[PDB]
Write a protein that binds this ligand. Structure first.
Ligand code: IMN
Ligand code: AZQ
Ligand code: MYR
Ligand code: MYR
Ligand code: MYR
Ligand code: MYR
Ligand code: MYR
Ligand code: MYR
Length: 582
């Protein structure tokens, strides 16, 4: 109302207010030490309390942007540490805020964060829960300047819960570790999806963004009217535009307004939004963004009715193309929660290409009469890959499934560096152990969101260190043709085998003491190298070599004088295997 800081403070609550202020500062002043931020927070919090006590106290009338910028310009070493950014302090609002946004470095040069020993973490956690948690909230935020603050807050709390539970455990490590690994992975995926989405908005434009959103929103909210979904797509697009620009405040408010709109009109949107709408102001957006799909209306007609058999098809389409196509998408998506979003777009594109040709023909109705037959092969392709790949993962385990993929992709793109192939294959492998668990009706949507991040990360690296035109093609292809393009890659006939290197296939006893994740990544690295040396080797030949090796290890690790063994048999294996592969 009269004082914005006061209002925010009352809504958020002291604890959340302080966490968010800390994050907001760490994202702009990525170089200042922890103690410096803690002091700014205390000062802002104290200031906020004065305003809560008296909305009319000095400066309490100033906007959050102005107050925020004034404090930022207080930093004494602003110029010495941030050089150019200091000049922003000479500008007036709103140029000042815009100037700050431009200097936020999406990827600073900070040391990697090393995970301490379980006991040290747990002890630090017990001795000062507050500074332990705020210390890492700081380290994470400064490293991910665009990570939406509230979401980061949500991760912190999941972190607190892991220590609280695990540090009291009998086997602290057995409890805590797997929790941290899951948190990290989920944290990495959330950050990558945010980056991906904003980058895509820049490349493909608003149209492609609206299409993706209509489809997505129709699956989750199948009972909502097309106009409401359109309303929602419109606002959602503004929201992502604002949020991508980087202004935390603008973004936060846009999201809040949308979640309230949605909660007020919930009975006309979805019946699954009950819980989400009762939760705290700070948790609404997040919750609704993850809400499960509502049940689709039981009495829904046939699409062929309004889109294939109708006589006004071309007349309606011409009158407002995107609207008509949007309607098609809406109708198709809410009937297919089991389809991935990208598949729905492929169907809409197909239907669009068809109407463009057909509506410019003598007898339209006859020209587009069998379009739904066009859809079949589009739908079946992804489905079959899912079946085939999940069956194979059922037989082999996560580890051996990862090796099968390793062989498969190394043969397809032999130019990619070995470490890159190992990482991508391992991740593809996890997508398999995470999605094949769901029933068929939920597999495709699952593979899509996970595969989208893996595929983009793969493309980012390669972009830096280009190595294959084919990968580059798939990487710069339409957002809808991406995964299909990679699926289409065929074995590389060109590739001339990498010459033999003794060292590369010589192993020592140190392999026996390595941890599981360590041994695997080591055997898997030799495997890629094996394939790059003998790309014409069949599955059979390769399978027999991996068996000798398998034995080789188990044998030498369970026998006196390891060193000699791995050096004596190393000769035999490498010699024998080389002969079996010619
Ligand atoms: C409901 O609104 C959207 C809009 C775009 C989305 C998503 C959700 C999700 C998440 C979800 O599937 O719900 C992902 C992964 N999007 C993209 O990758 C993407 C695609 C095209 C463009 Cl132009 C920009 C971004
Ligand atoms: C993944 C679910 C699709 C999806 C969804 O339901 N969303 C939603 N609402 C409330 C409809 N509001 C948003 C607010 C912020 C973000 C970052 C994303 C969404 N938005 C989506 O992207
Ligand atoms: C979001 C930060 C919450 C603070 C919880 C402390 C636990 C984080 C320690 C893990 C940092 C090492 C990075 C890693 O997991 O590899
Ligand atoms: C300088 C004090 C301002 C602190 C900035 C944080 C205020 C934003 C409120 C967040 C509201 C959550 C909205 C949502 O995403 O659901
Ligand atoms: C308000 C409705 C907006 C949606 C318009 C429907 C367009 C769907 C056609 C498929 C577009 C795929 C995007 C692309 O490849 O550029
Ligand atoms: C290995 C597991 C990969 C799953 C098969 C790919 C299916 C991807 C569906 C997404 C799409 O429609 O392109
Ligand atoms: C380099 C690794 C190539 C990336 C391939 C991943 C694409 C997954 C789609 C599934 C498939 O058809 O194989
Ligand atoms: C040309 C020398 C070939 C000998 C080296 C063989 C290395 C293959 C690695 C075996 C990986 C299989 C993994 C496993 O045993 O589970």
């Amino acid at each position: 109302h009269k004082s914005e800081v006061a209002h925010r403070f009352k809504d958020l609550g002291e604890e959340n207010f302080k966490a968010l202020v800390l994050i907001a500062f760490a994202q702009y002043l990525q170089q200042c030490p922890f103690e410096d931020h803690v002091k700014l927070v205390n000062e802002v919090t104290e200031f906020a309390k004065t305003c809560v006590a008296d909305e009319s106290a000095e400066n309490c009338d100033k906007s959050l942007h102005t107050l925020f910028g004034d404090k930022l310009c207080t930093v004494a070493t602003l110029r010495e540490t941030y050089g150019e950014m200091a000049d922003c302090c000479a500008k007036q609002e709103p140029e000042r805020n815009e100037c700050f946004l431009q200097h936020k470095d999406d990827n600073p040069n900070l040391p990697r964060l090393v995970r301490p020993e379980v006991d040290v973490m747990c002890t630090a956690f017990h001795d000062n829960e507050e500074t332990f948690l705020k210390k890492y909230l700081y380290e994470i935020a400064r490293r991910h300047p665009y990570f939406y603050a509230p979401e980061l807050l949500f991760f912190a709390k999941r972190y607190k819960a892991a220590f609280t539970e695990c540090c009291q455990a009998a086997d602290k490590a057995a409890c805590l570790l797997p929790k941290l690994d899951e948190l990290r992975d989920e944290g990495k995926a959330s950050s990558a999806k945010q980056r991906l989405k904003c980058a895509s908005l820049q490349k493909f434009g608003e149209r492609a963004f609206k299409a993706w959103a209509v489809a997505r929103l129709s699956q989750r909210f199948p009972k909502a009217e097309f106009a409401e979904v359109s309303k929602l797509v419109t606002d959602l697009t503004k929201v992502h535009t604002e949020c991508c620009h980087g202004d935390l405040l603008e973004c936060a408010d846009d999201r809040a307004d949308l979640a309230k709109y949605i909660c007020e009109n919930q009975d006309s949107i979805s019946s699954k939004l009950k819980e989400c709408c009762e939760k705290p102001l700070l948790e609404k957006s997040h919750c609704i963004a993850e809400v499960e799909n509502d049940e689709m209306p039981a009495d829904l007609p046939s699409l062929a009715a309004d889109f294939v058999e109708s006589k006004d098809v071309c007349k309606n389409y011409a009158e407002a193309k995107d609207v008509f196509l949007g309607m098609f998408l809406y109708e198709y998506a809410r009937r297919h929660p089991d389809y991935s979003v990208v598949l729905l777009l492929r169907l809409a594109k197909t239907y669009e290409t068809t109407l463009e040709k057909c509506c410019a023909a003598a007898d339209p109705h006859e020209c587009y009469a069998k379009v739904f037959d066009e859809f079949k092969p589009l739908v079946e392709e992804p489905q079959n890959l899912i079946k085939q790949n999940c069956e194979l993962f059922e037989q082999l385990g996560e580890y051996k499934f990862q090796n099968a993929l390793l062989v498969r992709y190394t043969k397809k793109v032999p130019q990619v560096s070995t470490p890159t192939l190992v990482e991508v294959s391992r991740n593809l492998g996890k997508v398999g152990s995470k999605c094949c668990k769901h029933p068929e009706a939920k597999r495709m949507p699952c593979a899509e969101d996970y595969l989208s991040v893996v595929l983009n990360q793969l493309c980012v690296l390669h972009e830096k260190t280009p190595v294959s035109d084919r990968v580059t093609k798939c990487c710069t292809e339409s957002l809808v043709n991406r995964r299909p393009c990679f699926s289409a890659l065929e074995v590389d006939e060109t590739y001339v085998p990498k010459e033999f290197n003794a060292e590369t296939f010589t192993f020592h006893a140190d392999i026996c003491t390595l941890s599981e994740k360590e041994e695997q990544i080591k055997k898997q690295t030799a495997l890629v190298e094996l394939v790059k040396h003998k790309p014409k080797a069949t599955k059979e030949q390769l399978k027999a070599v991996m068996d000798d090796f398998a034995a080789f290890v188990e044998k030498c690790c369970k026998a006196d004088d390891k060193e000699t063994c791995f050096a004596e048999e190393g000769k035999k294996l490498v010699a024998a295997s080389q002969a079996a592969l010619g």
